[PDB]
Amino acid sequence: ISGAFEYSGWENFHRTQWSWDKKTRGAHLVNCTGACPHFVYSKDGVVMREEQSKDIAPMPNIPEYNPRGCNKGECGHDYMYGPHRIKYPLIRVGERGEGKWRRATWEEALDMIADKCVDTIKNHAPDCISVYSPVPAVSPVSFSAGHRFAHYIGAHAHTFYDWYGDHPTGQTQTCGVQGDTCETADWFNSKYIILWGSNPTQTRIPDAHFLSEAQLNGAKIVSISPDYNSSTIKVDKWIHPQPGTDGALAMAMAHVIIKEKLYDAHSLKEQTDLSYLVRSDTKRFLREADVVAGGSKDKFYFWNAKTGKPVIPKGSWGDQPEKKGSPVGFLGRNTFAFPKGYIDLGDLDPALEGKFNMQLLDGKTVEVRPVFEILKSRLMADNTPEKAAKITGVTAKAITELAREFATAKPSMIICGGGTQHWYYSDVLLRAMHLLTALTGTEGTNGGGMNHYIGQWKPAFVAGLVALAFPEGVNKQRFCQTTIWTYIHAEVNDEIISSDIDTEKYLRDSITTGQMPNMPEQGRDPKVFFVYRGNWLNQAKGQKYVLENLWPKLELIVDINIRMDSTALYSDVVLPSAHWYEKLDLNVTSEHSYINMTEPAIKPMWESKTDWQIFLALAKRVEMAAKRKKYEKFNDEKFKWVRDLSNLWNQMTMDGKLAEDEAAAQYILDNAPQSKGITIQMLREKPQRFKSNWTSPLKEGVPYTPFQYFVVDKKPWPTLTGRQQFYLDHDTFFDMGVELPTYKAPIDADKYPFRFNSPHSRHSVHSTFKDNVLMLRLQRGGPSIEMSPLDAKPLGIKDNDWVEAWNNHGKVICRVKIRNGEQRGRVSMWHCPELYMDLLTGGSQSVCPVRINPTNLVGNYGHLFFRPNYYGPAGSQRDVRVNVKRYIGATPISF
Amino acid sequence: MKAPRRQLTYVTDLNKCIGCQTCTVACKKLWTTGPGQDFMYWRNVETAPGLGYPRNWQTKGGGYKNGELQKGKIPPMIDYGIPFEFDYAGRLFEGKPGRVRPSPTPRSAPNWDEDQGAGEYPNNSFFYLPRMCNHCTKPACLEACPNEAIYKREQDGIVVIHQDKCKGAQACVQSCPYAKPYFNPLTNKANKCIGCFPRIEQGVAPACVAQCVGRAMHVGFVDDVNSSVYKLIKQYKVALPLHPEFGTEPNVFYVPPVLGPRIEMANGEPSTDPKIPLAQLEGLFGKQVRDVLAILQSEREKKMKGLASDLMDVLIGRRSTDMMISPLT
Numbered sequence A: 001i002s003g004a005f006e007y008s009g010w011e012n013f014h015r016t017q018w019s020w021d022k023k024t025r026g027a028h029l030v031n032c033t034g035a036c037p038h039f040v041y042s043k044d045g046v047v048m049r050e051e052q053s054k055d056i057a058p059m060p061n062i063p064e065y066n067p068r069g070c071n072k073g074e075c076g077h078d079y080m081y082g083p084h085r086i087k088y089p090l091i092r093v094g095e096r097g098e099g100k101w102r103r104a105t106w107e108e109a110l111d112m113i114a115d116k117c118v119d120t121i122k123n124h125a126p127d128c129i130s131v132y133s134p135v136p137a138v139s140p141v142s143f144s145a146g147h148r149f150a151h152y153i154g155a156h157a158h159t160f161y162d163w164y165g166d167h168p169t170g171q172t173q174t175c176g177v178q179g180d181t182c183e184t185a186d187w188f189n190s191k192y193i194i195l196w197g198s199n200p201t202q203t204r205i206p207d208a209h210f211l212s213e214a215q216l217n218g219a220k221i222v223s224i225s226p227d228y229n230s231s232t233i234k235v236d237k238w239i240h241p242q243p244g245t246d247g248a249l250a251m252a253m254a255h256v257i258i259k260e261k262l263y264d265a266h267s268l269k270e271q272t273d274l275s276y277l278v279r280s281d282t283k284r285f286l287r288e289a290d291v292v293a294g295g296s297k298d299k300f301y302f303w304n305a306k307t308g309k310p311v312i313p314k315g316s317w318g319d320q321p322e323k324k325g326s327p328v329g330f331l332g333r334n335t336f337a338f339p340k341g342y343i344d345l346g347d348l349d350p351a352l353e354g355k356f357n358m359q360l361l362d363g364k365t366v367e368v369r370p371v372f373e374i375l376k377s378r379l380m381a382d383n384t385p386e387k388a389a390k391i392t393g394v395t396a397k398a399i400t401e402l403a404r405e406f407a408t409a410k411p412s413m414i415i416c417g418g419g420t421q422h423w424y425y426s427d428v429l430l431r432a433m434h435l436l437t438a439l440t441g442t443e444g445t446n447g448g449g450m451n452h453y454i455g456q457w458k459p460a461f462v463a464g465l466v467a468l469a470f471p472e473g474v475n476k477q478r479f480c481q482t483t484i485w486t487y488i489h490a491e492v493n494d495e496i497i498s499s500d501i502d503t504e505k506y507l508r509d510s511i512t513t514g515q516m517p518n519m520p521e522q523g524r525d526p527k528v529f530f531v532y533r534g535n536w537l538n539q540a541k542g543q544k545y546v547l548e549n550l551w552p553k554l555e556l557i558v559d560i561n562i563r564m565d566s567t568a569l570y571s572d573v574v575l576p577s578a579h580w581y582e583k584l585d586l587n588v589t590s591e592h593s594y595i596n597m598t599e600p601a602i603k604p605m606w607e608s609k610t611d612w613q614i615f616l617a618l619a620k621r622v623e624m625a626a627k628r629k630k631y632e633k634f635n636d637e638k639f640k641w642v643r644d645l646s647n648l649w650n651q652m653t654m655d656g657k658l659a660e661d662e663a664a665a666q667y668i669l670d671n672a673p674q675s676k677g678i679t680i681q682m683l684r685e686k687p688q689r690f691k692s693n694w695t696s697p698l699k700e701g702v703p704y705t706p707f708q709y710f711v712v713d714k715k716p717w718p719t720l721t722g723r724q725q726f727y728l729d730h731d732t733f734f735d736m737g738v739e740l741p742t743y744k745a746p747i748d749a750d751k752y753p754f755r756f757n758s759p760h761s762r763h764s765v766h767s768t769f770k771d772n773v774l775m776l777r778l779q780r781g782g783p784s785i786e787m788s789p790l791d792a793k794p795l796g797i798k799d800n801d802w803v804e805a806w807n808n809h810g811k812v813i814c815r816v817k818i819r820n821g822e823q824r825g826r827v828s829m830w831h832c833p834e835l836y837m838d839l840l841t842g843g844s845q846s847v848c849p850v851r852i853n854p855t856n857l858v859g860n861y862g863h864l865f866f867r868p869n870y871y872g873p874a875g876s877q878r879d880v881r882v883n884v885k886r887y888i889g890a891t892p893i894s895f
Numbered sequence B: 001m002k003a004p005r006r007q008l009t010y011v012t013d014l015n016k017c018i019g020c021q022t023c024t025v026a027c028k029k030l031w032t033t034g035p036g037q038d039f040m041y042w043r044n045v046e047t048a049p050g051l052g053y054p055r056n057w058q059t060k061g062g063g064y065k066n067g068e069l070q071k072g073k074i075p076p077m078i079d080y081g082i083p084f085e086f087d088y089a090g091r092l093f094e095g096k097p098g099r100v101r102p103s104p105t106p107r108s109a110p111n112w113d114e115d116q117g118a119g120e121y122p123n124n125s126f127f128y129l130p131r132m133c134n135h136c137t138k139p140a141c142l143e144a145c146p147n148e149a150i151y152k153r154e155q156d157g158i159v160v161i162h163q164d165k166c167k168g169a170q171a172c173v174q175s176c177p178y179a180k181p182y183f184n185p186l187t188n189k190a191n192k193c194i195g196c197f198p199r200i201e202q203g204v205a206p207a208c209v210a211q212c213v214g215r216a217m218h219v220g221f222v223d224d225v226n227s228s229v230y231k232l233i234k235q236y237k238v239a240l241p242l243h244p245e246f247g248t249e250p251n252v253f254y255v256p257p258v259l260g261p262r263i264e265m266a267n268g269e270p271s272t273d274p275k276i277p278l279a280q281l282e283g284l285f286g287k288q289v290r291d292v293l294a295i296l297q298s299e300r301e302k303k304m305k306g307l308a309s310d311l312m313d314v315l316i317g318r319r320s321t322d323m324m325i326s327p328l329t
């Protein structure tokens, strides 16, 4: 006998369901920040399912990252076989958006595109062509394909970090960095976490366990959110302010901490500009050029309380390192070239309080005060808990207690997100958050700091990406700033009267003085637009302006996609891109320190091609078109670059070296210090930890936390002052009233009664998986907008009724979900459902303009300059206001 | 039916479930992709309080009353939810006008009332309740079946519907008080959770455990004194079965939520009471809840003071293999 039990033979039916002949590595190349390792199971050449591989190496004493994954990821293979899939090259036959197509060969489709590209260069300008493809970390080879193509023909690229509102503007203003954040395992090292406009139960699904685990291990967690969000059911305390009033809350916390002397004075004196001396006459920093002949406009003073004399702090913009290093993309300047210990406080004792006299170059005596003295006086005057309680609706007692707890627990951390970053004035709010963190002195400590999480913006091996995407140098690449590009070319009405904020004047002056770019140059229209790896049109702010005003300027719109998204639906040519499980690419994120990847489980389906192979094929047909049109070489005076379109394919591949996808990916790994030594074969087997990181060392067995090269090794911060700089003494900051962190009330230019919130949902990754049938079956079959019962009932609105939301920018009609946890006075529409889904008109972006904050346009103040994804106007949208009413054309009964 | 040699045992930590539905999706894409199974979610996750799946399942009837088998209702299809269907082809590829609406007109679905819960702002409250077959020690489905098509495996205590022996009597559906057998109208057979016995047989945790992203799921044999399920059910005694009054002796247990904020009083200041009412948890898990929450609170408070707590460390689960049968596959 076999030993088998009575029904073992019949049970083979179920055993066969869990079987496969092939197992390969997979990843989901979507902008979720998960970068979750997966296996893909196939049988007879058909992918059956995927499952988390659960193979990130653990660190001692703290929970492992495994398994990661989420509800979209475990049905990711639905997009291989589903009704959305692009099988063949498609060319529009109807009007844009109708979904009337003809199938075309690759040859005809690429020839059409190639012919138009050459014509546009020949007849207009290369900068009338652009390529939008965001978040390189999600899929860096696929990103590099279109960018390298643009790189060699002179087309311009876009920005994404700021256009999305994810760029921590206030952090770049404070710290002189593009951005940085701890990996999420470091959350477990904190004793006290504030979740501030962040909903990780829904928006950090594979990482959320660290929070409940930290709590069971003795940490306390606070949630600050107007609505009772899904994350808040686990926290120890919930603070629910009015929307967009968080700055008032942060400044009152700063008040309590300063007044009650709960701050870390040593840290302030060494690591911030809060001892730097400010002239009482001009309100500017006292500078060396004021005091000394030929003195520097970029060196400053503090008052040394040990000697009773003014002293010039080391490390500021005018102080050079003796050994200059090369520029580093994520730093205002390469302060790593300074030696360790450079800004160590030594036996200095900078005064934080007092008034002092100093003698200028022209004899006269000026009163100077330390920044901290100015800040302190204003905070005592205007930012009491009692005053902030009136603005925020949070009790003064609660504000005070939060401030005390946050400053007392060590380490404490702020985790911020879209709820605090997607506002017009989010820059000054994040400065306030950084002020709270600097006062408690937790920057650069495990379990501490001001850690922002948003999208999948950070590729640690960025130098290898740049090498593949922009081989002749980023200084030889055209970039627009996409918020500006959209605002201008879509001819947006932001409803902000110029006598309140002269947006137009600031923007125009930004451009004509060269602080911010404007593409195309000389006022030409954009003409050709490549969109791929982003649903640019569906997610665009100002979408109704875009569709009416920008789209018709474009002569040719190409979408490359795995599926028919809304952008593709509104495109001229749609090219089938291979699914994540039919291609090779890398996949990384800021949330964990490991390199993920996908590889082909099977060959590209139907006639699809990988993104790398598509732009290689297009390169060949552009060569041919340039020949036919006798326009193969042309002078691009902007870069002193004689371009040769007849050799575009060899340019794309380095004479064929990088003609295979895998070699392109290996080229990235080889050309970054964070990854050199790692091979694809290693990554195929197991995810590999980065070898180094950005602004701190990456230590074996320890979670990354940023900025230790400044906090611990005492290199200067890459700011004008050389510190965490809370005083920005630029005209535009004075104009807007934010030379110091302070409360800026939200924009109320939309004259309508409900604030419009558009948070991110557990049920999709942006627009991707919105239309997935399983995801919809786990909701109510379509998009949702949420309302409090206290607003719905007076309007006659019942749960699951259709509601109409509108303002001057557009209107949307969507089914409502009445949720008691929603705060009265606001509605919450999960962002950017696809236009073709269960909406009677419009979508979330119909009601959103494009708005530009003038502080984000400053490009001539030390570390404030334009660099793509380093600084630029955020595409905020949480200030929007709408009205809501019941839609009465369809009122189905419930049962 | 006779006791099994070992009993596969689950623990669900409601302090850690994030309601992401990954487990719901994993089970469905593994076991219920076949004809007639579209409306079947062997694993499902419902917001509590709420109607659950199927709607109002908690008053469906079934189980045992003073040891006597109860015959409950058979839920109508609308209470499970007609699985929405969509015509993407027409709009996206065939030039048809008109939004890609769900069919039918939405009125019910397995997760219809997600995140609604109960209570008025600022004391609205809800949490997540994952559910599956409880592979009961007293399976009412098994006794009910007039064709002895349901059996309880001797090697691991997993309850299985034998698809050849089933004739579609639907007594199991009537008698399971958890509503976890689903009648398949295409095949005329009940289908339900198989405890992932094919994975268990190869030493791999069930998909709803191995793929749990919140890291809230435990599994093992309750006879293994070094397993987390033993420690939570038998040693520390903080894991309770769902609706014990149904009399089926479930082998799935729940650690009740002790995380969560306080009730907020009219002046904006906190009460000592939690937003999750004890009365709700008692409705789910019985009169032992109070004492469990006290243990949990006391042990968490040790951790807050920098002291050791073996129980907190069990729930934290710094290594997944301290919570479950190996999840690697």
Ligand SMILES: Nc1nc2c(c(=O)[nH]1)N[C@@H](/C(S)=C(/S)[C@H](O)COP(=O)(O)OP(=O)(O)OC[C@H]1O[C@@H](n3cnc4c(=O)[nH]c(N)nc43)[C@H](O)[C@@H]1O)C=N2
Binding pocket: A029, A030, A031, A134, A139, A142, A164, A165, A166, A418, A422, A454, A455, A532, A533, A534, A535, A536, A539, A540, A541, A560, A561, A562, A563, A565, A577, A578, A579, A580, A611, A758, A759, A760, A765, A766, A767, A768, A831, A832, A844, A845, A848, A877
């Ligand atoms: N009111 C409001 N507005 C907001 C926001 C808000 O909160 N409120 N949030 C923002 C934010 S923060 C973001 S990150 C955007 O939504 C991201 O949109 P995105 O187009 O990148 O993702 P999406 O997933 O939608 O598009 C990804 C596309 O890429 C396709 N795709 C995915 N993988 C591949 C691939 O490997 N190759 C190619 N060629 N394509 C691929 C995908 O099908 C989809 O079309 C934006 N606006």
Ligand SMILES: Nc1nc2c(c(=O)[nH]1)N[C@H]1C(S)=C(S)[C@@H](COP(=O)(O)OP(=O)(O)OC[C@H]3O[C@@H](n4cnc5c(=O)[nH]c(N)nc54)[C@H](O)[C@@H]3O)O[C@H]1N2
Binding pocket: A031, A032, A033, A166, A196, A197, A198, A199, A200, A202, A203, A204, A205, A224, A225, A226, A227, A229, A242, A243, A244, A245, A246, A416, A417, A418, A419, A420, A453, A454, A455, A456, A757, A758, A759, A760, A761, A762, A763, A764, A765, A766, A878
């Ligand atoms: N499942 C899933 N996860 C995702 C994404 C996705 O599409 N799907 N997108 C990823 C990316 S790219 C983004 S940028 C992030 C965004 O995800 P999050 O950073 O979490 O940001 P939101 O979802 O916009 O808002 C988070 C919470 O802040 C609340 N909020 C709104 N306004 C305010 C306010 O004025 N003050 C305060 N204190 N709170 C406010 C919101 O209601 C919400 O409860 O998610 C990432 N994670």
Ligand code: SF4
Binding pocket: A027, A028, A030, A032, A033, A034, A035, A036, A068, A069, A070, A071, A072, A073, A074, A205, A206, A765
């Ligand atoms: S979609 Fe993103 S979060 Fe979900 S499993 Fe895939 S990578 Fe992870």
Ligand code: SF4
Binding pocket: B132, B133, B134, B135, B136, B138, B139, B140, B141, B142, B159, B175, B176, B177, B178, B179, B180, B181, B192, B248
């Ligand atoms: S839960 Fe229902 S189906 Fe599962 S064993 Fe118990 S009685 Fe049977």
Ligand code: SF4
Binding pocket: B026, B027, B028, B031, B042, B043, B132, B133, B192, B193, B194, B195, B196, B206, B207, B208, B209
């Ligand atoms: S044990 Fe297996 S069959 Fe049962 S619910 Fe979990 S995944 Fe589904």
Ligand code: SF4
Binding pocket: B016, B017, B018, B019, B020, B021, B022, B023, B024, B045, B128, B130, B211, B212, B213, B214, B215, B216, B217
């Ligand atoms: S997967 Fe884990 S955390 Fe997510 S819903 Fe299921 S049990 Fe809860």
Ligand code: F3S
Binding pocket: B144, B145, B146, B147, B148, B149, B150, B161, B165, B166, B167, B168, B169, B170, B171, B172, B173, B189, B190
């Ligand atoms: S009662 Fe028995 S015959 Fe089938 S439908 Fe249920 S197992």
Ligand SMILES: [Mo]
Binding pocket: A164, A166, A454, A455, A456
């Ligand atoms: Mo984002």
Ligand code: NA
Binding pocket: B087, B090, B091, B096, B097, B098, B099, B100
């Ligand atoms: Na249609």
